[PDB]
Amino acid sequence: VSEVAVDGVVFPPVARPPGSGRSHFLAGAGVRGMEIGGNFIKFTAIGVYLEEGAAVSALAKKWAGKSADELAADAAFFRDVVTGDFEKFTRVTMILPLTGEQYSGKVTENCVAYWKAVGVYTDAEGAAVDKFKEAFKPETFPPGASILFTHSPAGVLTVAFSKDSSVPESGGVAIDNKPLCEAVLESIIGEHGVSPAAKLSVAARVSELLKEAS
């Protein structure tokens, strides 16, 4: 696949998550923002990488022969990407500066809000959120810094950090909680995913890769 540039952040076409031993291809990338003052403010650039070989083989079974527009409009496609039996890897690269405490507080607060509403919040998720916040607490992310998320096929979220766009080779903190692992990816590409740009990129690029497998 080709590289994708997002507002000064270059995402290479391949990634190797720290210590996973797998290679990924760039499924898609896009900016992520929040409405501030009635306008869209860009905060991060996000690249979504999927396991080479295994993601295409799994996704082709239900989504082969579908166009970019059809995949982009079908929330069940993105749900299949999130829950898929293959590794995923997300790189969040800062456009505006963020501190670990605020980023992790917001992510987890929103996860716990949902889980408890739908009554699936268990001690396990509370512990996973604590471990997630503990990993982010000492960290600050100037522009260009990155958060790296490995989403293992069984549902382990590994959290690592980088001062720039590069990916470390030594793994980060392993958080063995499938709900948190999927929620982090879901918050990006899900129905209410915070990056519509990333979602459109993934659907266009995966649609064309699915054609070379059929």
Numbering used by the authors: 4 to 217
Article, verbatim:
The asymmetric unit contained two molecules of PvCHI that did not display any significant interaction between them. As predicted, PDBePISA calculated that interaction between two PvCHI molecules in the asymmetric unit was low with a ΔiG of 1.1 kcal mol−1 and a CSS of 0.00, indicating its likely monomeric nature in solution. Among 237 residues in the native PvCHI, the electron density corresponding to the residues from 4 to 217 and 4 to 216 of the A and B molecules, respectively, were resolved, indicating the disordered nature of both N- and C- terminals. The three-dimensional structure of PvCHI displayed an open-faced β-sandwich fold with six anti-parallel β-sheets (β1–β6) and seven α-helices (α1–α7). The observed temperature factors for residues 35–39 and those constituting the α4 helix in PvCHI were elevated compared to other residues, indicating the intrinsic flexibility that allows the substrate to enter with a plausible induced fit. In addition, in the apo-form crystal structures of both PvCHI and SbCHI, the sidechain of Arg-35 in PvCHI (Arg-34 in SbCHI) was positioned at the substrate-entrance site and hydrogen bonded to both Thr-47 and Tyr-190 through water-molecules. The substrate specificity of type I and II CHIs has previously been attributed to the difference between Ser-190 and Ile-191 in type II vs. Thr and Met, respectively, in type I. PvCHI has Ser-190/Ile-191 in the α6 region and displayed significant activity toward isoliquiritigenin. The reaction rates for varying concentrations of naringenin chalcone displayed a typical Michaelis–Menten kinetics with a Vmax of 8012 μM s−1 and a Km of 16.04 μM.
Chalcone synthase (CHS) and chalcone isomerase (CHI) catalyze the first two committed steps of the flavonoid pathway that plays a pivotal role in the growth and reproduction of land plants, including UV protection, pigmentation, symbiotic nitrogen fixation, and pathogen resistance. Based on the obtained X-ray crystal structures of CHS, CHI, and chalcone isomerase-like protein (CHIL) from the same monocotyledon, Panicum virgatum, along with the results of the steady-state kinetics, spectroscopic/thermodynamic analyses, intermolecular interactions, and their effect on each catalytic step are proposed. The production of these value-added products also offers the prospect of increasing the value of the crop, especially because many of these compounds are soluble and readily extracted. This study characterized the enzymes involved in the first two committed steps of the flavonoid pathway, CHS and CHI, and the non-catalytic protein CHIL. Through crystal structure, molecular docking, mutagenesis, kinetic analyses, ITC, and FRET analysis, our study provides evidence supporting a revised catalytic reaction mechanism for monocot CHS and CHI and identified an intermolecular interaction of CHS with both CHI and CHIL in a non-competitive manner.
